[model samples]
Each structure stands twice: as C-alpha cells, then as structure tokens.
Target: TVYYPPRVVSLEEPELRLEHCIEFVVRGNPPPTLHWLHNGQPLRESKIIHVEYYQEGEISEGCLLFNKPTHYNNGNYTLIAKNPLGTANQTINGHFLKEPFPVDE
Candidate 1:
C-alpha cells in the first residue's frame, strides 16, 4: 500500500444557528484520524458537542455538531486530519448568541 499526506477539502463556511455545524471533507492514504480543537484546546464529545464522519472509498466527510449551543460554543474552531504521512487542518469561526439579543429592535 502507498502512503501520502492528508488533505482537507470543501471546508464549508461558518453557519449561524441555535445549533451549529462545522463541516469539511478529507482524503488521504490510510485514512487519517480526525480531531477538533476549540480555542486551541482539544474538544471533548458531550451531549451538546460531538464529531461525526463517514468514509466513501478515498474520501471522508466530517461534521462537528453543537446540538445545543450557547455563548460558550462561540469561538474559533479547528479541524485537523492527520496520519504518519502528514497533517491537514481548517479553521472556522463560530458565533452563537441568544435569539434577538438586542439587535436593531
């Protein structure tokens, strides 16, 4: 089998919602491992925050889901895909505020 560095593609733009999703795609040899970072710290899976992905042949789609987000979930996000070959990453900004939080009423 051949080995190559990982590459992240089709990184979606940030979306605003009560619940948010940070999505992206990845491709590489040996299928790199995926990880998420919030504010430069490792993110752990919980009821409100978790990661999901699926593979189709040589590519994989990933989603970092915030099922019930709040102000704490508003910040910078980083998605990293890596293996022995190399590593790839994408950054996204998340903004979550209460509905009608005093905006031009």
Candidate 2:
C-alpha cells in the first residue's frame, strides 16, 4: 500500500516585537521535519532561541522562540516541511523593532 501526505500550510507576515513570542502554524501529514532558513541559508541552533514542535489534531505546527529579537532577525524566513514522500515549504516575512527610541533629528 502507498500513503500520500498532505501539503503544509502556513501564515504570511506574522507580526512580532522585541523579546516577544510568536508561533508559525504548519499543517501536514506523515509528519515533516520543520526547520528555519534565513537568507536562503539554514539557521543554526545557536542563532535561534529554540524550536518547538506541536500537534493540534491532524496538523503539525512549529513555534520558533526568540528570547530577544534583533534587527538581523527581520527578513524572509522559509519553513521547510519534508517527508519521505515529498516536501513543501512556506515563506514568511518577520519584522522586529526595539522600543524606547528618541525623536529623530
């Protein structure tokens, strides 16, 4: 017997702030390995706070935690979900801003 998996679905342009928390919802079948890629390069564990995987019903989601967000954190993030059968990806643009800024001269 052959088993086919479902495609991964994700959100677009999720808003987040410095030291704030955000989660990216991804749904798929057969369970795919989700990872973060920045600027077309894979992000290392040291670069990110931590990655957590969750399952709500038939959907599998991942939450990327940012202890203290930085300017470099803002950019195009690619979420890749892959399985033995096939692979799928979703791109989200993230923006982070620091608080307590003085008036511009």
Candidate 3:
C-alpha cells in the first residue's frame, strides 16, 4: 500500500453571523485523521460548539459549528490533517463582533 500525505480540497470562508460553520473537505491515501485547534490549543466538542466528520474512502469532510455565538468566540481556529506520511494545516481568524476586528501589523 502506498501512503499519501493529506491535502485540503476546499474550505469555507468565515463570515460574521449569529451561527458559524467552518467546513473543510480533504483527501489522502490511507485517509488522514482530522483535528481541530483553537488558539493553538486542542479544541473539544462542547454545548456551544459541535464537531462532525465524514469519510468516504480517501476523502473526508469535517465541520466546526458554532451555535449561539458571541464576542467571546473571537479567536483563531486551525484544522489539522495528519497521517503516517505527513501533515497539513489551515487557519481561520474568527470574529463574532459587530465591527471588524483590528488587524495585527
């Protein structure tokens, strides 16, 4: 069997809303395991947020859903895909505030 590193196919852009769903689709040989991180820390499923994953052969789909979001939800979110071969990651800056968050120079 050949081992292939994970690759991200598609990812949704984060938008300001009462609820947010960050969706990502990826593929790899010997399918990679997906993990979520918030502010560089491992994020877990909670009452306010939900994590879901679906796999079909080498392809996988994942979602990080935020329900009843608040300003406190503002932070950085990362999606990590890892396998024995290699790893890949993507980041999203979350902003649930009425005004756009200030950009760091």
Evaluated with TM-score, which candidate comes out highest? 1
- lDDT for position 8 in model 1: 94
Task: Give me the runs in candidate 3 sitting further than 4 Å from their true place.
Answer: 1-18, 54-56, 98-105
On the 0 to 100 scale, the lDDT of residue 68 in model 2 is 72
- By lDDT: ranked, best first: 3, 1, 2
Residue-wise C-alpha lDDT for candidate 2, range 1-105, written one tens digit per residue: 988898668767878755444577765666566777976789776545677666543376657777777777777778887777888887877787644566887
Clashing pairs in 1: none
lDDT, candidates in the order shown: 0.79, 0.71, 0.82
Best by lDDT: 3
* Positional deviation of residue 35's Cα in model 2 after best superposition, in angstroms: 1.6
User: Which whole-number lDDT from 0 to 100 does residue 15 have in model 3?
Assistant: 82
Instruction: List all candidate RMSDs to the true structure.
Output: 13.6, 14.0, 13.9
